[PDB]
Design a protein around this nucleic acid. Structure first.
Lengths: 170, 215, 188, 197, 137
RNA sequence: AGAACUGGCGAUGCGGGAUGAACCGAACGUAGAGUUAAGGUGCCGGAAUACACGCUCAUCAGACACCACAAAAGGUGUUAGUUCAUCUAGACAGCCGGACGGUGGCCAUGGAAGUCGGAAUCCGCUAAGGAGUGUGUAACAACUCACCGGCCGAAUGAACUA
RNA sequence: GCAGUCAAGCGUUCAUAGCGACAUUGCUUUUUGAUUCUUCGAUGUCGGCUCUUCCUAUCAUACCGAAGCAGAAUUCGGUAA
């Protein structure tokens, strides 16, 4: 769905003789609130020895985009599970917001490398501030000055089943 | 894919020649840059052994341009950048310290004979030979038949190779083809003279740029 | 990887003019006129000024861009044929049977005739295409010379002339008869 | 919207046309399809020949007459692809195929009437550019239709007669448009413009 | 007549400042100017005078209009609004025939039955003068 | 062929899997309106030739669990990736020039002079050039590469992952 | 198949744990075309006359490719029922 980027904060358990466990925050991409709490324990159990019954979640926050109408180049580090063993991948997306860029990534992974939602891990999504350090080629070609490209051979969608005009393109 | 012994040198060899030019300047007071486009390899060696006190360095252009310092402001020793701009051809720098007269006397006196890359020779209308009419044909040995598919293709009966029409490989007053150079080259005709030329001299302690031309 | 646009540049010298409606290309110059169809190749031609013409493919993949380079190679071959022209000179090595080659006109069709090839009584005919002139090389023994404006009119008729004389059921290393293309060059 | 609708067959795809025709016949509209020999099939030519040959060998072993009748004509090829879409064994399917008439070329009286096209079945709107297609008129010639030298000749006779009509029609519209232009600026013209005509 | 007659094949091509028309969506028939092109299929549009909010849109939902004006790449909404007035494209749009055709079928839908009667009586009067002017010359 | 826990068929229809005792939804009085399950929405056939990002061309393509098909291993066909090197002090491709003296090195010998062969296998001078990559003369020569150099001006090469 | 020599690959972070392809080397009755007439035992029923079709995994005819093929004669391979 429309992903929403969430901050989840976790505090293991207040016990006698160990007060104040430190605190643990993460940034989670999930389609709603309830998945992001469950996606939180999926990673945080891998990092150190906790459980959901030995845990509680402090607070959740919805992180909006800082600047939607600005156009950003994004470099995304991705770890994912293949049919063979897992291996890393670095990909670059040009998009409008952070949370819309992950939308175009999962579609890109499912198209080319046939990876569903459960196999992919999102390592770090970063904005590349300066230009001319863009590594990939297919992102780089839009950075040329005075870029103008035509859209030839446009089709037309007409509601009536019969048209009399012998219809023509552009 | 190959299995040859000799391997690529790399960037470090380009910085070694960058190192050799710097040390050669302050040691030997005269610097000589030359336009030597076509040279033979034993011709290059005998110039080195005729100048035993000298050090001679050949190398790539922008390396030798930067080793003198291609910028005006940046240089090893002073007034060095004007001579570096002049040398357009393939260069080999020279470092002798005896005389400004002996060196320009040497290159004008020195001359050899190499390939044309002038005079005209016709192939006789009989059986062709390796010399091709240089010596009398009774002393001549016929050409190898294996290089005849090279002659029917690249140069455009019995194993002795036969032409039926007379062919002229050169004509006088004419620029020779790159193909017509190879016709004289295969026959073994080194009748064109070869001479090396110099464009500029430099003196370190005088520290001025000298401009000249000999052809 | 969906290249956004790719272009090449076809140079036009002073002798020739080119007039292009949708994809039909006409080349008119000194030696003659040549035409070529291009409805299948899907490009866009654009003149800048009278000597350079850019071709362009917008938003095409690798297979679409690979066809764009050979469009430049076809139209450049058309221009040189109108200026310099093409000339293929062929020699025919016979072992024991002398090959008689003649040019006979059959109701206006101008067929190239081959006789006595390797002791065959079969009389082969090779038709001359439109826009190619065959003449025999004066003062050079054993040569047939093909010359024309178009590459595809000449080079096909050169290749058709050699495959009609192909040796069968024999070791080809010992039997060396045939007609071969010596070299490919220009008229001027 | 009309009693009998005449579909021009040129530049369409076999399947995507026959789908939208078969729904109109089951809804009661009468459709007559002309110029069948200009119809197109996606995919390259050598494919669609072999899709016909593996069909062509399928016939009843004990008596070849009783098997699938392999029709050759481009109308009959197209009528096949439509017949599989309508449930032709019931009484609803028989009365739905009596509303359909498919012809090669344009025979009289259908040359005097308007021909239409179907935008969701045009080749030039459906397939991507740089993609091989196949002309059905060439296809039936490769499998035994001995009439492409006749139907194409009658079209060259027709189009000359049709070009004379259009020039007479275009000059008459020129007189009307000139008369309509000088009729403008009148008080009846300006009141119409306010109302939008 | 030694000239190369090679055709141009003129096209509306996307750029910074190509004004467009949004056919479907929330906006539904409003003008807007492309601010920055994102990739092959998405752009970034804004029209402040018409009323469309600044948003990223797919090129499927938008149609290209031939009018252009000069505007720097990546401009904000205040800067597009100032360049919009200097070109005066809202006056240049209604001069075009394609804007008049939009307004005409809008007016023909809002015609009252009594006004639909008045359209009838006038066209009966207009055809009388035409058929006299026709069939004489 | 013989067991273990639970559900089902046998005794049980109805909707879905074209068809089917066992799968999926759901268990039945007679009827009306409403919303859904599993499954589906080009046409048969009720229902979007809806929207959105990509991939794939097959001279036997492919289309949905139970289920009616397939193996290793190959394929400059295409796509996205990893690790590595080269490069605006000029890379990759192209033409063009150099590719030498000790030394025709030693045994093999009718004769390989780098290249029928066998062991062996360094220096000199070098920007660089093998006691030699191949075409081969009966042995020579010559040509080519592998090594640099001059033109030439944007990235390129190699293995591997799926 | 067994007994070996390897190591192109793999073993959670890894050579020497543990496998381990293509390879490679060996006997199981005679390295000198001498022999050596060794047909060493299938435990539910089909064969042939007539007469059609179909599969291709092609013996012959058609056109091709490669050869370590002069011609002839053959050997190997492809399309093809």
């Amino acid at each position: 769905a429309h992903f929403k980027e969430y901050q989840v904060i976790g505090r293991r358990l207040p016990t006698e003789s160990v007060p104040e466990p430190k605190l643990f925050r993460m940034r989670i991409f999930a389609s709603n609130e309830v998945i992001a709490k469950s996606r939180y324990w999926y990673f945080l159990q891998k990092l150190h020895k906790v459980k959901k019954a030995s845990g509680e979640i402090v607070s959740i926050n919805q992180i909006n985009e800082a600047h939607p109408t600005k156009v950003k180049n994004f470099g995304v580090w991705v770890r994912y599970d293949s049919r063979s063993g897992t291996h890393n991948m670095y990909k670059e997306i040009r998009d409008v917001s952070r949370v819309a860029a992950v939308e175009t990534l999962y579609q890109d992974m499912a198209a080319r490398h046939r990876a569903r939602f459960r196999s992919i891990h999102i390592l770090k999504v970063a904005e590349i501030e300066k230009t001319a350090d863009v590594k990939r080629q297919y992102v780089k070609q839009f950075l040329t000055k005075d870029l103008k490209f035509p859209l030839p051979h446009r089709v037309q969608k007409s509601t009536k089943t019969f048209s009399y005009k012998r219809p023509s393109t552009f | 894919v190959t299995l040859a012994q000799t391997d690529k040198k790399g960037r470090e060899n380009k910085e070694r020649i960058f190192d050799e030019v710097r040390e050669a300047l302050d040691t030997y007071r005269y610097v000589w840059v030359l336009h030597l486009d076509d040279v033979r390899t034993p011709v290059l060696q005998e110039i080195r052994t005729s100048w035993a006190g000298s050090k001679l360095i050949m190398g790539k252009r922008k390396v030798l341009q930067k080793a003198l310092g291609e910028k005006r402001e940046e240089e090893y020793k002073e007034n060095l950048y004007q001579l570096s701009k002049l040398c357009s051809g393939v260069t080999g720098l020279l470092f002798t310290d005896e005389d400004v007269n002996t060196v320009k006397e040497y290159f004008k006196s020195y001359v050899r004979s190499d390939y044309s890359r002038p005079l005209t020779f016709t192939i006789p209308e009989g059986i062709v030979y390796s010399r091709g009419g240089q010596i009398p044909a009774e002393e001549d040995v016929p050409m190898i038949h294996s290089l005849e598919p090279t002659m029917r293709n690249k140069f455009e009966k019995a194993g002795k190779i036969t032409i039926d029409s007379p062919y002229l490989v050169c004509t006088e007053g004419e620029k020779l083809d790159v193909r017509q150079a190879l016709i004289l080259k295969q026959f073994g005709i080194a009748a064109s003279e070869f001479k090396v030329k110099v464009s500029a001299y430099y003196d370190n302690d005088s520290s001025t740029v000298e401009s000249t031309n000999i052809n | 990887m969906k290249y956004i646009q790719t272009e090449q540049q076809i140079e036009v010298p002073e002798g020739v003019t080119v007039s292009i409606k949708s994809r039909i290309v006409k080349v008119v110059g000194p030696r003659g006129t040549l035409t070529k169809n291009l409805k299948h190749i899907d490009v866009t031609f654009t003149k800048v000024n009278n000597q350079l013409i850019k071709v362009a493919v917008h938003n095409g993949g690798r297979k679409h861009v690979a066809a764009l380079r050979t469009v430049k190679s076809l139209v450049d071959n058309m221009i040189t044929g109108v200026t310099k022209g093409y000339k293929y000179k062929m020699r025919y090595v016979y072992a024991h049977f002398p090959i008689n080659v003649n040019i006979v006109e059959k109701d206006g069709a101008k067929f190239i005739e081959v006789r006595n090839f390797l002791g065959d009584k079969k009389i082969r005919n090779v038709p001359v295409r439109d826009g190619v002139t065959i003449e025999f090389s004066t003062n050079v023994k054993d040569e047939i010379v093909l010359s024309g404006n178009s590459v595809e009119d000449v080079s096909q008729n050169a290749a058709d002339l050699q495959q009609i004389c192909r040796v069968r059921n024999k070791d080809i290393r010992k039997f060396l008869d045939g007609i071969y293309v010596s070299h490919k060059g220009f008229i001027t | 919207v009309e009693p009998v609708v005449v579909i021009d067959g040129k530049g369409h795809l076999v399947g995507r046309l026959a789908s939208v025709v078969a729904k109109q016949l089951l809804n009661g509209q009468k459709i007559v399809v002309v110029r069948a020999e200009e119809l197109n099939i996606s995919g390259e030519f050598f494919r669609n020949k072999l899709k016909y040959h593996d069909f062509l060998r399928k016939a009843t072993a004990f008596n070849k007459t009783r098997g699938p009748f392999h029709f050759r004509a481009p109308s009959r090829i197209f009528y096949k692809a439509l017949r599989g879409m309508v449930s032709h064994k019931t009484a609803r399917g028989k009365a739905a195929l009596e509303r359909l008439k498919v012809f090669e070329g344009i025979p009289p009286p259908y040359d005097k009437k308007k021909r239409v096209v179907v935008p969701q079945a045009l080749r030039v709107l459906r397939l991507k550019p740089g993609r091989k297609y196949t002309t059905l008129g060439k296809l039936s010639t490769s499998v035994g239709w001995k009439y492409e030298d006749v139907v194409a000749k009658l079209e060259a006779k027709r189009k000359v007669s049709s070009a004379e009509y259009y020039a007479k029609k275009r000059a008459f519209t020129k007189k009307v448009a000139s008369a309509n232009a000088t009729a403008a600026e009148s008080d009846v013209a300006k009141q119409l413009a306010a109302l939008g005509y | 007549s030694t000239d190369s007659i090679v055709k141009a094949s003129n096209w509306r091509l996307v750029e910074v400042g190509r004004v467009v028309l949004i056919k479907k969506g929330q906006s539904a028939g409003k003008l807007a100017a492309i601010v920055e092109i994102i990739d092959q299929k998405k752009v970034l549009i804004d029209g402040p005078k018409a009323g469309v909010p600044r948003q990223a849109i797919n090129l499927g939902q938008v149609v290209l209009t031939p009018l252009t004006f000069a505007l720097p790449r990546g401009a904000r909404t205040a800067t597009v609004s100032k360049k919009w007035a200097a070109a005066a494209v809202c006056e240049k749009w209604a001069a075009s025939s394609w804007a008049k055709k939009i307004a005409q079928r809008e007016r023909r839908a809002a015609l009252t039955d009594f006004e639909r009667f008045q359209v009838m009586v006038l066209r009966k009067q207009k055809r009388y003068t035409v058929k006299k002017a026709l069939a004489k010359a």
